[PDB]
Structure formats: C-alpha cells, structure tokens
Design a protein around this ligand. Structure first.
Ligand SMILES: [K+]
Length: 217
C-alpha cells in the first residue's frame, strides 16, 4: 500500500505545475485539507513562516524535521539570492519525499537534504557543510526533538546572537519542556504566534525564540 506522504507527492505530481512553488503549496494544502489530515496549512502555518523569513532575511537556514516537504518548499521559495536551506530528517522515506517535492517545485538548487539523526549530523555541520553559525532554525514535525536539538545546536556553537529559532506546532499543553526552556532562559527572547483562522480554537501555534548569546546586551 501507499503511505500518506507518497500519496501527497503523487497528488502534487498529477495536479500541480512543475517549477511553480505556489502551485505545489496549494496542491499539498488542498489535498491534506480534503483528507482532513491538516486544515489550511497555508493560512495557519505558512503565513507565519513567511513573515518570519521576510523579517530576518536569513542567508543560512537549518530545518530540523520534515514529512512531506511543504515546509521546505515554503521557506526555499523565499530565500534571497545566495541563501541556502539545509534540511535534516532521520526518516529516509520522509527525506525522499521532501527531495522530490523540492525538485517538482524547481527549488532543489537552494536546498541540501541530509538524511540522518540530528545527534550524528549536527556536530558535523561546521566541518562537513561549511557552517559558521546559523541565521535561522526551523523546528518541525517532531515535538520531542525540539529541546534536545536546541541544546545540541548550542553545544556545537551553531547559534549566534540573533539566531532565530521558529518551532512549529507548539500548542499548550504540548512541548512543555521546550517552551519551559526558551521562555525561562535569559538567553532567549520569545514570541508566540497562534493562528485561529476563522475559528475559536487554535489551528497552529508557533514559537519564535531569538538567541541572545550568554552575555548582557
Ligand atoms: K526566555
């Protein structure tokens, strides 16, 4: 049988326009919304992602976690000339779908997909992928990995003063440890975004946590 992620890709391949990221995004959103797997992702998640990317204009973005590639396409289409996205995902099936989604959208030249465990790959980023510090980190899909990945990024010296972390699907009482960490820490300045669409209950919540370094301003 076919996986949900493979079915999302097949729908894009059959219905979207190659080389048109907006078309790809709309197709994913339309299909997942119809199936009731995810409701109006463009409005609830994508608009917030776009606003953050446009505010900080990051040259180097690291995405931790991927499923069908929606988030990677969303970010990559807004990267400035010369900017790049590194996307790390442990599940080889999800990584493969994400690559194919970026290919279809025509964005593969701006993105490098790294299939492996974050604990193994994060310490190799500086030497293997020419990374000094990251401008933005997008934490996606796997809520329980947000905190240990953040701590490992710090240990590896990959965050600088002003590095923006944006974490998806942070909705109280979920991600209690990650929120407790960034909110409680004097090294992170935090903003929470809650998208309601037209409804009374949160559809998606995201946390922006800006690293300040270890010292006084
Ligand atoms: K804080």
């Amino acid at each position: 049988g076919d996986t949900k992620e493979q079915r999302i890709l097949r729908y894009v391949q059959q219905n979207a326009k190659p080389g048109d990221p907006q078309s790809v995004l709309e197709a994913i959103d339309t299909y997942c919304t119809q199936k009731e797997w995810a409701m109006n992702v463009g409005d609830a998640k994508g608009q917030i992602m776009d606003a953050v990317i446009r505010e900080y204009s990051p040259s180097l973005v690291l995405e931790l976690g991927a499923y069908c590639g929606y988030s990677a396409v969303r970010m990559a289409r807004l990267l400035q000339p010369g900017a790049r996205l590194l996307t790390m995902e442990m599940n080889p099936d999800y990584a493969a779908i994400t690559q194919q989604m970026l290919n279809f959208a025509g964005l593969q030249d701006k993105v490098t997909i790294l299939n492996g465990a974050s604990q193994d790959l994060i310490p190799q980023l500086k030497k293997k992928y020419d990374v000094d510090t990251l401008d933005m980190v997008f934490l996606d899909h796997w809520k329980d990995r947000y905190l240990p990945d953040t701590l490992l990024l710090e240990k590896c010296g990959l965050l600088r003063k002003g590095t923006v972390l944006l974490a998806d699907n942070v909705i109280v009482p979920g991600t209690p440890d990650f929120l407790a960490y960034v909110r409680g820490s004097s090294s992170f300045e935090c903003t929470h975004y809650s998208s309601y669409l037209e409804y009374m209950k949160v559809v998606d919540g995201l946390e922006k946590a800006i690293y300040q370094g270890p010292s006084s301003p």
